[PDB]
From a paper:
Microtubules are formed de novo in a process termed nucleation, which is spatially and temporally highly controlled by γ-tubulin complexes, composed of γ-tubulin1 and associated γ-tubulin-complex proteins (GCP). In most eukaryotes, microtubules are templated from a preassembled γ-tubulin ring complex (γ-TuRC) that determines the position and direction of microtubule growth. Here, we used cryo-EM to identify and characterize γ-TuRC assembly intermediates after recombinant expression of the complex, which allowed us to delineate a comprehensive stepwise assembly pathway from a stable 6-spoked core to the mature 14-spoked γ-TuRC, identifying successive stabilization and conformational locking of γ-TuSC units as central principles in the assembly process.
In the next step of complex assembly, a second γ-TuSC unit is recruited to the GCP2(5)-facing side of the assembly intermediate, occupying positions 3 and 4 of the fully assembled γ-TuRC.
Residue numbers in the entry:
A (entry chain k): 11 to 75
B (entry chain j): 7 to 113
C (entry chain F): 485 to 505, 524 to 811, 827 to 890
The structure:
Amino acid sequence: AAAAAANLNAVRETMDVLLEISRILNTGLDMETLSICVRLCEQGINPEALSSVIKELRKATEALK
Amino acid sequence: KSPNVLLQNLCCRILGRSEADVAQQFQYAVRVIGSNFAPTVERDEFLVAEKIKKELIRQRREADAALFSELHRKLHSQGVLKNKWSILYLLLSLSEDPRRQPSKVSS
Amino acid sequence: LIGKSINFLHQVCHDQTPTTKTDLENAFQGKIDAAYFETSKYLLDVLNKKYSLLDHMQAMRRYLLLGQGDFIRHLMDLLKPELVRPATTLYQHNLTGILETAVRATNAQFDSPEILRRLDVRLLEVSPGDTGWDVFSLDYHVDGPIATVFTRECMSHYLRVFNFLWRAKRMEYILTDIRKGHMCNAKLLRNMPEFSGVLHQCHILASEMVHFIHQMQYYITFEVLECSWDELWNKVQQAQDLDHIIAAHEVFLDTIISRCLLDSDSRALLNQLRAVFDQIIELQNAQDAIYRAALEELQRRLQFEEKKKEEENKRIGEFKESIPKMCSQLRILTHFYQGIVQQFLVLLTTSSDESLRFLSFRLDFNEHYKARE
């Protein structure tokens, strides 16, 4: 169809603008980790939870590995 | 996908470790996500947009503070998302100091 | 302007006074000129005296353009340890509270009460990773009918200027900290002459930075903060309508922000100045590491000799190999610095060069620069 590929376009655009937003705010998250986090917040989830987890998981490979 | 196994996929992207090598990291993910399982937080994305613009003025790059404004408009312009607030709150909270940002490609 | 001025005098300033009273056989002109002079001058008389516009513009320079000196040095001397720690622990009320007693301790307590109530600490925001030096500007709010003269948009540009000079005074007293380390440590380093070479190596990079910075201070002193102030003072004494005050004071602002490196084209020069701002605090870590290592052996050697009243020959082995590695580290630091400062002067090329020539003139002397040393 047309509106089914325009729906597939409307995520691909937003994932590209959020990729600019990710580097200008200087996170350690790349595009691959970003895609999981955008699926989680597509369902709806506390970002306050996700922030504390990633502050620990990133701290779980620079002093435990 | 179910969210519980999605946490373990996240743990194998962030850390190079497999999902059968450790279970403690996944257990901490279950510890925080569980008993917070449903969304209960409130969004005020207006205030957080106004707080990103003050930060981009603080870099003393003022052309890029208004380029973000037009890129922030586009997320509402498409509007296929759940909350615009959530991923932006996550991405603001994890900030490090680029000291003033010695470059930006601007797409 | 006439009807607007008399309305403004009544409604905001809260003074009720009727003072005032071929085209049409030229009927308009005489009463219009008279009314012009009388109403606008009376309005300026009540703003200059009663709401003290005169002291307020004087203290605008003193606080937002950092043109007092006493206040800032006192401020930084007491407020180093809090501000160096990140803004996640900083809380604005502590800074405001320490400031008032600090002003009473030094000489800024003989000031008029008006300027003492306008000042308060202004935070920007708390975001992780920033040092507290990054989010610190004085507010210096202003209210009244004078608020129409001094806009918020004025203060915004002032805060940017504040940020530049605030760096250029923090870093300057960090250079003074470098010099303090040199002077008050070499006076007890008269035990051993083995240090003299690498000590000279530290001293020369200190002196190289002093020649830049102390000149740069003089440049800001006499050609950014004095010429504009002279022009501003004369444009204030010349005023006979309030629009003259506004449309001259904005030129005062718009020439400070162009004499300082905050334009669209001068951003690259500021960027390279940031490298100098990096190397000065890097030299702070270079110096203390030498002292904290060198001094330790001498104390334990004194205690080893008091035991006897070949073990300390093995400390000489680590010393004799650590002096080249430390020396070469400082050498590549100096080479980095040399390349950057000569690139700074050689980047200066003609596209307006109306204040960058004037800084280079004073920075370049003995013609050691562009003689290739």
